[PDB]
Design a binder for this molecule. Structure first.
Ligand SMILES: NC(=O)C1=CN([C@@H]2O[C@H](COP(=O)(O)OP(=O)(O)OC[C@H]3O[C@@H](n4cnc5c(N)ncnc54)[C@H](OP(=O)(O)O)[C@@H]3O)[C@@H](O)[C@H]2O)C=CC1
Ligand SMILES: NC(=O)C1=CN([C@@H]2O[C@H](COP(=O)(O)OP(=O)(O)OC[C@H]3O[C@@H](n4cnc5c(N)ncnc54)[C@H](OP(=O)(O)O)[C@@H]3O)[C@@H](O)[C@H]2O)C=CC1
Ligand code: NA
Lengths: 175, 174
């Protein structure tokens, strides 16, 4: 029970890249993870009432397996045609600060999850709307790729914990 | 024991060490606990030799703000940069060539690869790093010198909070 929080929760290489240069997540997919442990997906997703993601993140979701989530989803895109029948969603284009009160209203008192990518998260951080960042670092470097949070920003560390092959850490907005 | 080679460095949470203005500003007013988990004091006592790039050696001499009594090797093509105040052996070339000498001078303690990311990557590429230990500061930089600029795979040992920092240690697969 809190005011609705907006949280950016993502996996990353230990050196700060999500997606590699070849546009894939193979470095992520066969790692040990414990979805019911510390910062695990099972406890996290129960707190969440709505998803928001960019166009590439949405395309990745509709093109790999069939990740099923119960919450409504918003996609930041100039391309409505991306919509797949397997993943219905609401398109929004423009300033995320205008979208944010609708996400909070659509979340049913639960939290807003910023799925990615780093450019979408930075938009929310530049509008001052991210309350928490949760990064699960995989035990590899990539050197190059999409950056986890491509800007200058300051946070307060809450804590970190190992979860399988991952280092999971949560930071909070300074007050 | 077996002499290990360890890359131990601070980084922003998003993977940059030196910022775009060539400074370590965002690092210096942060709470850390030297004798805590992965803290500097417990680390340094396991170290018998240091090795670092030219730019790191220059900042250390110019900020003159840090002490050490292990012997130090500096990877530089400008052996002119040496300061009497911070003694060191110059080496240039393939670090795989230098690494037997570091290990023999380590007196059975470990070799600390200080930085930068480029120097760490040359060791990793020659399969010479046994452990990476990164202390992540609670900030992002977006750009700057990369913590480890190459593709590599590791096994996670563990992480722990130390003051403002997330510290984590990964090991070479064996
Ligand atoms: N680790 C994970 O959970 C997963 C990661 N991947 C994702 O693949 C992504 C690719 O990276 P990145 O490029 O950062 O991708 P994003 O998913 O953030 O997509 C960015 C694109 O979204 C559109 N967009 C972003 N902001 C707005 C806006 N305010 N208004 C309208 N359109 C906007 C633009 O596309 P356009 O103009 O063409 O519409 C832009 O190119 C990774 O970042 C990662 O998140 C994939 C699956 C899972
Ligand atoms: N650990 C930390 O958090 C600290 C970091 N620093 C900072 O780090 C920064 C330096 O980082 P970075 O720029 O990555 O540089 P490095 O310290 O790794 O130095 C890179 C330079 O060292 C030389 N070099 C590298 N490899 C070799 C080789 N095998 N043989 C011969 N010469 C070699 C080259 O210089 P050349 O050919 O000219 O000799 C190269 O340009 C400094 O700007 C400093 O501010 C400072 C204090 C603490
Ligand atoms: Na609505």
């Amino acid at each position: 029970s809190h005011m609705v929080k907006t949280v950016y929760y993502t996996a990353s290489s230990l050196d700060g890249y999500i997606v590699d240069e070849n546009q894939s997540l193979d470095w992520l997919t066969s790692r040990d993870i414990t979805p019911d442990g510390p910062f695990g997906y099972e406890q996290f997703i129960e707190t969440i009432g709505v998803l928001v993601m960019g166009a590439s993140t949405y395309e990745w979701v509709v093109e790999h397996g069939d990740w099923s989530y119960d919450q409504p989803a918003w996609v930041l895109t100039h391309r409505p045609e991306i919509a797949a029948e397997s993943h219905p969603m609401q398109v929004f284009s423009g300033d995320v600060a205008e979208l944010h009160p609708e996400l909070v209203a659509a979340a049913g008192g639960k939290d807003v999850w910023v799925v990615g990518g780093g450019d979408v998260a930075a938009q929310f951080v530049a509008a001052d709307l991210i309350d928490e960042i949760i990064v699960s670092y995989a035990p590899c470097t990539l050197g190059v790729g999409s950056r986890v949070l491509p800007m200058r920003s300051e946070w307060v560390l809450d804590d970190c914990a190992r979860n399988g092959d991952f280092v999971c850490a949560r930071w909070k907005r300074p007050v």
